[PDB]
Amino acid sequence: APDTSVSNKQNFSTDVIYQIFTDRFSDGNPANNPTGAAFDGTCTNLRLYCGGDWQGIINKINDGYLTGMGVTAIWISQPVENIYSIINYSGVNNTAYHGYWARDFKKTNPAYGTIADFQNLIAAAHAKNIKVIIDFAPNHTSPASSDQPSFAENGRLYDNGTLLGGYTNDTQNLFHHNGGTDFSTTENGIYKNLYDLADLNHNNSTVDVYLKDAIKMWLDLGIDGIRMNAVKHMPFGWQKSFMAAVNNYKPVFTFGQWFLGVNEVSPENHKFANESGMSLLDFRFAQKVRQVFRDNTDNMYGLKAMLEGSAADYAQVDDQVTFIDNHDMERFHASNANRRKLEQALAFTLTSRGVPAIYYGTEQYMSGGTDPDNRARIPSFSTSTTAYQVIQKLAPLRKCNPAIAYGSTQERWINNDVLIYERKFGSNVAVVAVNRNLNAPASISGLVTSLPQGSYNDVLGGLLNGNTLSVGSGGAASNFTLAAGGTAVWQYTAATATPTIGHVGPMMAKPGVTITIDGRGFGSSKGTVYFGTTAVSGADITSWEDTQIKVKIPAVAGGNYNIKVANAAGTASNVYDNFEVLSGDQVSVRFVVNNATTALGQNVYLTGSVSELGNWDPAKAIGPMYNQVVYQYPNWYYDVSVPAGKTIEFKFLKKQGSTVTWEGGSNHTFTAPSSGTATINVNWQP
Ligand SMILES: OC[C@H]1O[C@H](O[C@H]2[C@H](O)[C@@H](O)[C@@H](O[C@H]3[C@H](O)[C@@H](O)[C@@H](O[C@H]4[C@H](O)[C@@H](O)[C@@H](O[C@H]5[C@H](O)[C@@H](O)[C@@H](O[C@H]6[C@H](O)[C@@H](O)[C@@H](O[C@H]7[C@H](O)[C@@H](O)[C@@H](O[C@H]8[C@H](O)[C@@H](O)[C@@H](O[C@H]9[C@H](O)[C@@H](O)[C@@H](O)O[C@@H]9CO)O[C@@H]8CO)O[C@@H]7CO)O[C@@H]6CO)O[C@@H]5CO)O[C@@H]4CO)O[C@@H]3CO)O[C@@H]2CO)[C@H](O)[C@@H](O)[C@@H]1O
Ligand SMILES: OC[C@H]1O[C@H](O[C@H]2[C@H](O)[C@@H](O)[C@@H](O[C@H]3[C@H](O)[C@@H](O)[C@@H](O[C@H]4[C@H](O)[C@@H](O)[C@@H](O)O[C@@H]4CO)O[C@@H]3CO)O[C@@H]2CO)[C@H](O)[C@@H](O)[C@@H]1O
Ligand SMILES: OC[C@H]1O[C@H](O[C@H]2[C@H](O)[C@@H](O)[C@@H](O[C@H]3[C@H](O)[C@@H](O)[C@@H](O[C@H]4[C@H](O)[C@@H](O)[C@@H](O)O[C@@H]4CO)O[C@@H]3CO)O[C@@H]2CO)[C@H](O)[C@@H](O)[C@@H]1O
Ligand SMILES: OC[C@H]1O[C@H](O[C@H]2[C@H](O)[C@@H](O)[C@@H](O)O[C@@H]2CO)[C@H](O)[C@@H](O)[C@@H]1O
Ligand SMILES: [Ca+2]
Ligand SMILES: [Ca+2]
């Protein structure tokens, strides 16, 4: 199959995700509706169950609503079993309608449906070329009070019906008991509870194994991707081990939720996306989009800076999931606002780099404030809205024009209100023009592009007041008027002669695992695959076609390798960096160093004899380590993904910037567990 096939679970760049709040989409099976005080059929009480379910989604998939829009992927509420409690908050009744209050990761939420219902959903979707993504929140269970066990379900955790433990009397330490987070620091947000939710302790062996076993179940059920909840609130090392588990079994496209506020640019966030084994929801993109197109707090210059900065900050920018709003933000469309604002933002997102995600109902001009006002029941299934049509015309471009899916981004024309950008991949090109100024047209002269000579019709058909583009030799466009609030899309596709890599997935795994390499001009005959300088050919290359290659990772030493391919004739392609070859199966180990004093601004890091520990290279050391919550300074701790059953040598370091102070004496030594977790505790050697 080609790169665009529904079967491609490793790449979503050619797709368009539709974010569904299951309960608020469509109640296709009233028989499974919750009853009494936990339900409101009218969906007037936004905190109770409204009845939306999997059967409903199936119906919507079957009746053309999503397909007619060009949607090729869906992201649904967490499917696992949630508590049944009806909680009274501020005099208001609340339910688990959102799917975030888990009780059993190996069962389904009966309100959504049964396992059989789930299987059917998967089948229905696939039959319509729609990939299925599930929300997964292994960071906590549900609302609890250690002092008052009768409150809710006491964050109880079950294993396929078998009780493991609750928040009260947590002798095994399945959960964290450090109060609630205040988001003052990263460490703080990880080792403390979100709201009143029972925080899961991933260092607990039972929890580790269980969670890993659970995801396997869902993978076995046929999912195509995973949306990881609050990744900024779980230990990074643990998550890396989780991704390894997934990748070394059945790799699927995974992206996490790492919230960013307005004007917020985080290096920690970049690093996580670059080395965790998963990508992230593009908050930087989303926030900038709202500023420029919605709240008028920034202009095109800021939009361009975000695009350029992001492309450099993210090793795999094309893996970031873009959006303009979500279940945790106020709806993009303001009641009294000009609809063109939303239309423009949509078009921008659909034609930009990454993986676009659209929050259900956006296309219906839904308005609403923060939770739960942004989660009303979809008021219509009309295909006649302008927004619907915008998506309908642009979504498919992601499939047919690889420039949109894998291309670079380049500004071609700009002013306070206008932005004209170009996407390019091999012989493929796409040019988009946006004039956010709703009252003034712009006179466009001097525009230069990569489009061949000719005339180009607006892909939007003038829907957003766009126009035809005339390109002479040299890619120079003839003078034209860009209507007030105008938006136009011009594109070109053609055969690519030379092998071009547009995407690789997964990006982190152990030898023997099969990876997917997508792009154009690979040819039909098996060529050669390079991992760094190492060449792979023949048998290990499972399949080879023009747009996609399937190959087994070679048994090279653990480390980072750049990927390249060559056609059967020996022609090399571009290089796709940052591939991570693991040393083997991974386990999550907690490292604790005692009595490591430092000066303000100086932190402790971990280094060692394996790739996972940076192979003694301080620049690749793990950290900075933590010293407030679990353990207190001068004792430091950190959770790390290491190779199972291996004997590892390690040392600690103290660093100020890139300046490094090595721990004295001899190296510490330990043997990693074969499965489950472990905690290594030593004293800093002077
Ligand atoms: O020994 C004494 C005592 O100790 C112990 O008690 C302590 C507790 O153990 C401890 O946890 C602590 O609890 C208290 C809280 O600390 C305190 O805040 C207060 O909590 C209140 C809330 O204030 C109040 O609002 C309400 O909360 C309701 C909500 O109103 C309601 O909306 C609903 O929310 C749920 C959502 O609907 C649902 O979707 C889901 O949300 C998801 C979200 O959808 C998902 O995408 C993801 O989002 C996160 C994101 O990951 C994260 O980054 C973050 O984003 C922030 C950014 O990072 C920041 O930069 C900045 O921008 O801000 C944003 C947003 O904050 O947040 C996103 C979510 O907003 O993740 C979400 C979670 O999966 O789930 C939502 C939560 O359920 O439902 C909640 C109810 O849960 O009510 C709570 C509780 O009353 O009060 C708590 C109780 O006091 O402190 C206790 C005392 O010290 C012992 O237990 C006790 O016995 C002992 O006596
Ligand atoms: O907002 C998050 C903060 O996180 C980071 O802070 C780090 C420091 O950079 C580390 O050096 C370390 O801090 C130690 C400190 O090294 C140690 O001396 C001691 O600090 C004393 C301090 O010497 C003294 O002058 C006085 O201020 O009292 C302090 C309390 O002991 O203990 C510190 C830890 O408590 O660890 C912190 C993280 O905990 C980041 O670099 C900061 O910018 C940021 O504030
Ligand atoms: O190149 C392959 C080599 O790899 C392995 O060597 C590792 C060591 O095992 C680590 O311990 C570490 O070495 C540190 C050392 O721990 C640290 O003390 C420091 O050494 C100073 C020393 O403190 C000082 O007294 C004086 O002796 O100078 C030394 C500096 O040279 O710095 C070392 C790092 O430079 O890292 C090395 C890899 O760099 C393996 O064990 C070796 O057998 C192998 O050759
Ligand atoms: O001609 C190449 C030139 O095109 C663009 O410059 C625009 C500029 O953005 C407008 O504000 C206005 O001044 O017209 C110029 C074209 O004459 C690119 O921005 C620029 O990099 C490029 O050199
Ligand atoms: Ca139902
Ligand atoms: Ca946590």
Residues listed for the chain = 686
- Residue 378 is given by DSSP the state P
Q: What are phi and psi of 448, to 5 degrees?
A: -125, 135
Give the technique used to solve this structure.
X-ray
Q: What is the CATH number of the domain that holds 542?
A: 2.60.40.10
Q: Which domain holds residue 511?
A: 496-582
Distance between CA atoms of residues 210 and 212, nearest Å: 5
* Contact indicator for 557, 573 with CB cutoff of 8 Å: no
Q: What CATH number corresponds to the domain at position 480?
A: 2.60.40.1180
* Best residue for ligand 2 mutational test, from 630, 631, 633, 655 (most atoms within 8 Å of Cβ): 633
Check if 601 has its Cβ closer than 6 Å to any atom of ligand 2. yes
Alpha-carbon distance 404 to 424, whole Å? 7
Does one domain contain both 179 and 251? yes
- CATH number where 84 lies: 3.20.20.80
422 in the same domain as 391? no
Residues 357, 478: one domain? no
Same domain, residue pair 390 and 500: no
Q: What count of other Cβ atoms lies within 10 Å of the Cβ of residue 205?
A: 16
Ligand 3 pocket: which residues have CB below 6 Å? 616, 651, 662, 667
Asked if residue 519 lies in contact with residue 544, where contact means CB atoms within 8 angstroms, the answer is no
Closest CA to 679 of 139, 204, 211: 204
**Chain-centre distance of CA 264, in angstroms?**
18
Q: Cα separation of 482 and 467, whole Å?
A: 8
d(CA 323, CA 130): 19
Whether 481 and 554 share a structural domain: no
* 291 C-beta closer than 6 A to ligand 1: no
Distance CA(64)–CA(388), nearest Å, equals: 13
Please tell me what DSSP assigns to residue 377.
P
Please check whether residues 392 and 451 belong to one and the same domain: no
Same domain flag for 244 and 130 = yes
Alpha helix (H) ranges present in 236-339? 236-247, 267-275, 283-293, 300-313
> What is the C-alpha to C-alpha distance for residues 375 and 301, in angstroms, rounded to an integer?
33
Evaluate the CA torsion angle 286, 291, 295, 296 in order and state its sign: negative
Considering 400, 422, 452, which residue would you say is the last residue of a domain? 400
Classified as helix, coil or strand, 379 is coil
Residue 196 beta carbon below 6 angstroms from any ligand 1 atom: yes
Distance 420 CA to ligand 4 centre (A): 10
Same domain, 240 and 214: yes
Work out the number of other CB atoms within 10 angstroms of the CB of residue 601: 8
Rounded to whole angstroms, the Cα distance separating 301 from 418 reads: 9
Neighbours of ion ligand 5 (CB under 5 A): 27, 29, 32-33, 51, 53
Does one domain contain both 81 and 158?
yes
265's tokens: 């640019």
Judgement on whether residues 605 and 507 belong to the same structural domain of the protein: no
Asked which of 451, 479, 495 is the last residue of a domain, the reply is: 495
First-to-last CA distance in the chain?
Answer: 59
Tokens (6 digits) for 399: 């499939």
578 and 666 co-located in one domain: no
Residues within a 6 A CB radius of ligand 4:
412-415, 445-446, 448
**Could you say which of 400, 418, 452 is where a domain stops?**
400
DSSP 578-634: EEEE-SSSEEEEEEEEES----TT-EEEEEESSGGGTTT-GGG-B-PPB-SSSS-TT
Nearest to 558 by CA among 617, 511, 611: 611
Determine whether 440 is exposed, middle or buried from the number of CB atoms within 10 Å of its CB (0-12, 13-18, 19+). exposed
Alpha-carbon distances, residue 145 vs 138, 168, 170, 180, 200 (angstroms): 19, 7, 12, 11, 14
Per the structure, the count of domains in the chain is 4
Q: How far is CA 295 from the centre of its chain?
A: 25
| 307 and 382 within one domain | yes
Q: Which helix (H) or strand (E) holds 246?
A: helix 236-247
CA dihedral 353, 354, 355, 360 (to 10 degrees): -70
Q: Count the neighbouring beta carbons within 10 Å of the beta carbon of residue 103.
A: 20
Q: Which atom of ligand 1 is nearest to the CA of 192?
A: 11
Radius of gyration, CA atoms only, the chain:
26
